[PDB]
Scaffold this active site. Structure first.
Site, PDB file in Angstrom:
ATOM      1  N   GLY A 168       3.238   5.630  10.028  1.00  9.08           N
ATOM      2  CA  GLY A 168       4.615   5.471   9.454  1.00  9.08           C
ATOM      3  C   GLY A 168       5.493   4.137   9.955  1.00  9.08           C
ATOM      4  O   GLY A 168       6.350   4.319   9.520  1.00  9.08           O
TER       5      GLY A 168
ATOM      6  N   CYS B 286       4.324   1.304   9.258  1.00 10.19           N
ATOM      7  CA  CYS B 286       4.228   0.173   8.242  1.00 10.19           C
ATOM      8  C   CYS B 286       5.452  -0.294   7.602  1.00 10.19           C
ATOM      9  O   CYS B 286       6.190   0.408   7.475  1.00 10.19           O
ATOM     10  CB  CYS B 286       3.156   0.244   7.043  1.00 10.19           C
TER      11      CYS B 286
ATOM     12  N   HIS C  82       0.808  -1.194  -0.118  1.00  6.97           N
ATOM     13  CA  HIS C  82      -0.212   0.084  -0.112  1.00  6.97           C
ATOM     14  C   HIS C  82       0.769   1.271  -0.150  1.00  6.97           C
ATOM     15  O   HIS C  82       0.264   2.641   0.127  1.00  6.97           O
ATOM     16  CB  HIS C  82      -1.083  -0.135   1.117  1.00  6.97           C
TER      17      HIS C  82
HETATM   18  C1  LIG Z   1       1.214   2.190   7.952  1.00  9.38           C
HETATM   19  O1  LIG Z   1       2.040   2.775   8.820  1.00  9.38           O
HETATM   20  C2  LIG Z   1      -0.285   2.158   9.051  1.00  9.38           C
HETATM   21  C3  LIG Z   1      -0.059   1.680  10.584  1.00  9.38           C
HETATM   22  C4  LIG Z   1      -0.956   2.029  11.278  1.00  9.38           C
HETATM   23  C5  LIG Z   1      -0.861   3.814  11.640  1.00  9.38           C
HETATM   24  C6  LIG Z   1      -1.779   3.853  12.770  1.00  9.38           C
HETATM   25  N1  LIG Z   1      -1.422   2.656  13.646  1.00  9.38           N
HETATM   26  C7  LIG Z   1      -1.151   1.598  12.604  1.00  9.38           C
HETATM   27  O2  LIG Z   1      -0.511   0.682  12.894  1.00  9.38           O
HETATM   28  N2  LIG Z   1      -1.228   1.338   8.396  1.00  9.38           N
HETATM   29  C8  LIG Z   1      -2.302   2.194   7.799  1.00  9.38           C
HETATM   30  O3  LIG Z   1      -2.691   3.247   8.062  1.00  9.38           O
HETATM   31  C9  LIG Z   1      -3.297   0.975   7.154  1.00  9.38           C
HETATM   32  C10 LIG Z   1      -3.146   0.939   5.518  1.00  9.38           C
HETATM   33  C11 LIG Z   1      -4.182   0.130   4.822  1.00  9.38           C
HETATM   34  C12 LIG Z   1      -4.075   0.100   3.382  1.00  9.38           C
HETATM   35  C13 LIG Z   1      -4.234  -1.243   5.443  1.00  9.38           C
HETATM   36  N3  LIG Z   1      -4.721   1.385   7.357  1.00  9.38           N
HETATM   37  C14 LIG Z   1      -5.074   1.414   8.820  1.00  9.38           C
HETATM   38  O4  LIG Z   1      -4.388   0.870   9.584  1.00  9.38           O
HETATM   39  O5  LIG Z   1      -6.429   1.772   8.996  1.00  9.38           O
HETATM   40  C15 LIG Z   1      -6.613   2.010  10.526  1.00  9.38           C
HETATM   41  C16 LIG Z   1      -5.928   3.231  11.010  1.00  9.38           C
HETATM   42  C17 LIG Z   1      -5.532   4.220  10.144  1.00  9.38           C
HETATM   43  C18 LIG Z   1      -5.002   5.435  10.618  1.00  9.38           C
HETATM   44  C19 LIG Z   1      -5.000   5.424  12.020  1.00  9.38           C
HETATM   45  C20 LIG Z   1      -5.555   4.480  12.673  1.00  9.38           C
HETATM   46  C21 LIG Z   1      -6.045   3.387  12.280  1.00  9.38           C
END
Ligand SMILES: *[C@H](O)[C@H](C[C@@H]1CCNC1=O)NC(=O)[C@H](CC(C)C)NC(=O)OCc1ccccc1
Ligand SMILES: *[C@H](O)[C@H](C[C@@H]1CCNC1=O)NC(=O)[C@H](CC(C)C)NC(=O)OCc1ccccc1
Lengths: 299, 301
Positions: B141, B143, B39
């Site tokens: 950030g 991921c 992603h």
């Molecule tokens: C990648 O850095 C991120 C890790 C999240 C950021 C907040 N805590 C984490 O572990 N992953 C994502 O943002 C992910 C991307 C999708 C394409 C799978 N989406 C996600 O985690 O959705 C839930 C969410 C997003 C933002 C803040 C809190 C939860």
């Protein structure tokens, strides 16, 4: 929210093994000096009651076998600084990070890189207890393992491991060789002072529990700083200073809970207990996160 | 008895950052390949409902910014494998450790090196829950941060971070990009299944108590594996597998306590509680120490 240690790579590249006769332990190799606990020069009989200056003057450079991995380093000098031995070697450690030696205060935290035979085994987070012990995880051969913090690529060494007390807690020195606490490097049973709980850390952790969606312990009561400190001292908690209250400012502003309101919460918690509930998965009040530790992890 | 991470230095030397457009995450640089969550190729808005095959069609080698610190690594090829992107780069990482890619089971633990902008930030021990989530500590950030075990200088990578679920737990893939559990990399509402207690690890923890002299809970009964599994499920405990019985073997030998005897001891704890007694100074049964973690910590591995 977890107990999180600093990445240990910068310290791993500094660990070596130091051997004198039959005794083996770890050393910290920075530039051309190896730092290690002085009781490496002790035999088993020596340890019981050593006279270190007298033991050290009888040693030669070649009594010290220092190994960095498979490579022996040749000792070309040696001196003693308090409880720490400084071995001058004929090679400079290329992996020496930017570093400092600091003496930490009680209630502060640091990461420990546990090592055996000069090889890293594990990393974990510790706090300097108010009685200057640390609740570590150290076995035979772990002496010379160091504690540290990392700030922008600079490693601040604060702890070197020397011993385990009969109660299972651990004692050591700063990198200058001075013990934390009233302990000596002698193979004798030693008791610590009565430990107390690090109050400002407990409050930081209660704020962490709120940032993470747990609020069951909160209340609408209030307390003055002095009235809270009276109850805290009654329960073997360290006093909360205005400096602590200020240090908690960011955590208070983030959650919108005034510091003295969280003090009221902890007071109720101390006087009523947790009633079999848990906070951040813990049945006991946790005191080894500093305010900065909470901020770093939560933001 | 404390949770201890593996030393992280061998993994630190492999962390890089990967950017597409404005999206930056972490990557794992092994030999001349960089592994990262796919992603990274999404825009803010495209994450809601991404078509990864079509998004990748519009990408070329020159759309990927791979940096080790501030030093750019030229991307010379890209492919998608499940939910990970593999970026071929023109430099073999000189810090590449001996390594393997492994898919772990629920209950297994690993160290996580939390990274941001390709810069390591902290290291902590995690367990894979039976619902295939991890109770992690991750921020925006993070991921691409990886989870790993080490055995005799060989790093076994088992986890790459992708997301946070509404309950605050985390989900991700192995290093072949296959999610643990039934999750997808879409910013959609997803929910972890009901969690259960990791029985094999609770048993490991009982053995650790016995090793240290805390053995009041040892009873005079035994049980069969099948009878135990049927009762354990009634208490929201995982059933034991044959592999679980075998990995308890070393602790059973060290203490002289049969695995099925310890099972019958745990059953009594489940049916009667602890009656205000502690085990290793805890009133709670701990379930994120594996048998290996108990051995690793009682030995100087
Ligand atoms: C990648 O850095 C991120 C890790 C999240 C950021 C907040 N805590 C984490 O572990 N992953 C994502 O943002 C992910 C991307 C999708 C394409 C799978 N989406 C996600 O985690 O959705 C839930 C969410 C997003 C933002 C803040 C809190 C939860
Ligand atoms: C250094 O490897 C070692 C670390 C100890 C080993 C057991 N767990 C540890 O952390 N240090 C010592 O063995 C130390 C050496 C003295 C000369 C300072 N002695 C020690 O820890 O024993 C303490 C003790 C002595 C007598 C009764 C009870 C405890």
């Amino acid at each position: 929210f977890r107990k999180m240690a600093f990445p240990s790579g910068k310290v791993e590249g500094c660990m070596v093994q130091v051997t004198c006769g039959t005794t083996t332990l770890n050393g910290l190799w920075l530039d051309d000096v190896v730092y290690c606990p002085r009781h490496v020069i002790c035999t088993s009989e020596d340890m019981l009651n050593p006279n270190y200056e007298d033991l050290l003057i009888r040693k030669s450079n070649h009594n010290f076998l220092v190994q960095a991995g498979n490579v022996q380093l040749r000792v070309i000098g040696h001196s003693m600084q308090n409880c720490v031995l400084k071995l001058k070697v004929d090679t400079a450690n290329p992996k020496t990070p930017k570093y400092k030696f600091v003496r930490i205060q009680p209630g502060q935290t640091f990461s420990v890189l546990a090592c055996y035979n000069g090889s890293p085994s594990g990393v974990y987070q510790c706090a300097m207890r108010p009685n200057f012990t640390i609740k570590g995880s150290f076995l035979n051969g772990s002496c010379g393992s160091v504690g540290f913090n990392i700030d922008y690529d600079c490693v601040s060494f604060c702890y070197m491991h020397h011993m385990e007390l009969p109660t299972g807690v651990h004692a050591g020195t700063d990198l200058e060789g001075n013990f934390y606490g009233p302990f000596v490097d002698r193979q004798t049973a030693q008791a610590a002072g009565t430990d107390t709980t690090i109050t400002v850390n407990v409050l930081a952790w209660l704020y962490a529990a709120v940032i993470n969606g747990d609020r069951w312990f909160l209340n609408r009561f209030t307390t003055t700083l002095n009235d809270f400190n009276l109850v805290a001292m009654k329960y073997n908690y360290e006093p909360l200073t205005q400096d602590h209250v200020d240090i908690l400012g960011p955590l208070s502003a983030q959650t919108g809970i005034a510091v003295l309101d969280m003090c009221a919460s902890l007071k109720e918690l101390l006087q009523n207990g947790m009633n079999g509930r848990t906070i951040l998965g813990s049945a006991l009040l946790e005191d080894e996160f500093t305010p900065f530790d909470v901020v770093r992890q939560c933001s």
